[PDB]
Structures are given as structure tokens and as C-alpha cells.
Write a protein that holds these residues in place. Structure first.
Motif, mmCIF file in Angstrom:
data_model
loop_
_atom_site.group_PDB
_atom_site.id
_atom_site.type_symbol
_atom_site.label_atom_id
_atom_site.label_comp_id
_atom_site.label_asym_id
_atom_site.label_seq_id
_atom_site.Cartn_x
_atom_site.Cartn_y
_atom_site.Cartn_z
ATOM 1 N N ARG A 70 -3.362 -0.034 -7.351
ATOM 2 C CA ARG A 70 -4.267 0.264 -6.225
ATOM 3 C C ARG A 70 -5.549 -0.557 -6.346
ATOM 4 N NH1 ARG A 70 -6.041 5.872 -3.123
ATOM 5 N NH2 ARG A 70 -7.093 4.768 -1.402
ATOM 6 N N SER A 71 -6.127 -0.652 -7.535
ATOM 7 C CA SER A 71 -7.423 -1.361 -7.746
ATOM 8 C C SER A 71 -7.269 -2.901 -7.784
ATOM 9 C CB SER A 71 -8.097 -0.883 -9.002
ATOM 10 O OG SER A 71 -7.567 -1.553 -10.141
ATOM 11 N N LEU A 113 -2.402 3.453 -10.353
ATOM 12 C CA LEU A 113 -3.897 3.381 -10.183
ATOM 13 C C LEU A 113 -4.391 1.947 -10.403
ATOM 14 C CD1 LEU A 113 -5.151 6.607 -11.984
ATOM 15 C CD2 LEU A 113 -5.471 6.034 -9.564
ATOM 16 N N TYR A 133 -5.976 0.297 2.139
ATOM 17 C CA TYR A 133 -5.711 1.407 1.205
ATOM 18 C C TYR A 133 -6.392 1.139 -0.137
ATOM 19 C CZ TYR A 133 -3.009 4.501 -1.872
ATOM 20 O OH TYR A 133 -2.643 5.423 -2.822
ATOM 21 N N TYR A 169 -4.402 -4.892 -6.161
ATOM 22 C CA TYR A 169 -3.373 -5.524 -5.297
ATOM 23 C C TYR A 169 -4.082 -6.387 -4.239
ATOM 24 C CZ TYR A 169 -3.737 -2.242 -1.288
ATOM 25 O OH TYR A 169 -4.150 -1.562 -0.174
ATOM 26 N N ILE A 212 2.492 1.842 -3.392
ATOM 27 C CA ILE A 212 1.560 2.325 -4.437
ATOM 28 C C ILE A 212 1.276 3.810 -4.207
ATOM 29 C CG2 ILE A 212 -0.774 2.106 -5.305
ATOM 30 C CD1 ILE A 212 -0.417 -1.001 -4.538
ATOM 31 N N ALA A 213 1.019 4.195 -2.961
ATOM 32 C CA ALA A 213 0.672 5.573 -2.561
ATOM 33 C C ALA A 213 1.840 6.503 -2.924
ATOM 34 C CB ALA A 213 0.352 5.601 -1.084
ATOM 35 N N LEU A 229 1.631 7.132 -6.637
ATOM 36 C CA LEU A 229 0.464 7.974 -6.977
ATOM 37 C C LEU A 229 0.753 9.411 -6.557
ATOM 38 C CD1 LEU A 229 -2.483 5.557 -6.119
ATOM 39 C CD2 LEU A 229 -1.654 6.234 -8.362
ATOM 40 N N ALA A 282 0.846 -1.222 0.000
ATOM 41 C CA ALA A 282 0.000 0.000 0.000
ATOM 42 C C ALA A 282 0.876 1.265 0.000
ATOM 43 C CB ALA A 282 -0.949 -0.010 1.164
#
Length: 113
Positions: A93-94, A90, A113, A96, A72-73, A76, A69
Motif C-alpha cells: 500500500r505504501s 501494508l 488508494y 505501489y 492490496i485492499a 489487508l 489497489a
């Protein structure tokens, strides 16, 4: 919590094969991207996560998912909306959480997340 290394390493390996841009494979070098460490406080990458699972630095499956998480953040936050890298982040995120579930990890859907 227990750290399931098998399931967590599987999880990391799956995210590795899906990282087509190889943007998550290695730590961001200051030699390549000197602003990066000014912008990102908690750099994390799939190699460090792998090492952290192997050595038992992570207390639980949930910390492993949090590290992914954070990863990825970071991407982004650092990347401009619209670029290939922001789009891949993105996408990550959708998906993982379903990659985690496909490797037999428990996911807290409301909290993740």
C-alpha cells in the motif's frame, strides 16, 4: 484515458519481483482457502491483471492502478494485522504508487488508494 501496456506491464513485473511471499502472483484457490470467496467479492491477482492489460480489458492506466489497489485492499481485509502477509500488504500500500511512478505512470495522489 489511453492504456499504456509497456508501462503497465513493467509496473506489474516490478510488483511481481517485490512480492517476496508470492501472495499476489496467482488467484486464491477455493481448494486452498474455502472461506476466501465468501469474504472477498472482487478477487484480483497480478496474473489476471497482466492478462487484462495484454488483451486490453483495461481502458486506462488508472484502471490498472485501481486493480492493483483492489488487490492490496483484499489482502489487508482478508489477513490478520501483524502477520507477514498483512505486513507485506501494508508495505505494498505504501510503495505501489512510487513503483507506478518509477515505471512512468501518472498518479493522482489525492485520489489513489
Amino acid at each position: 484515458g489511453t492504456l499504456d501496456k509497456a508501462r503497465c506491464l513493467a509496473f506489474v513485473h516490478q510488483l511481481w519481483d517485490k512480492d517476496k511471499l508470492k501472495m499476489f502472483h496467482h488467484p486464491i484457490s477455493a481448494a486452498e482457502l474455502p472461506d476466501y470467496h465468501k469474504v472477498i467479492n472482487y478477487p484480483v491477482d497480478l496474473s489476471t491483471i497482466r492478462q487484462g492489460i495484454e488483451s486490453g480489458k483495461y481502458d486506462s492506466d488508472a484502471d490498472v492502478q485501481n486493480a492493483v489497489a483492489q488487490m492490496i485492499a483484499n489482502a489487508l481485509e482478508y489477513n490478520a494485522k501483524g502477520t507477514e502477509w498483512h505486513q507485506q500488504a501494508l508495505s505494498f500500500r505504501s510503495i505501489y504508487l512510487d513503483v507506478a511512478r518509477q515505471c512512468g505512470l501518472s498518479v493522482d495522489d489525492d485520489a489513489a488508494y
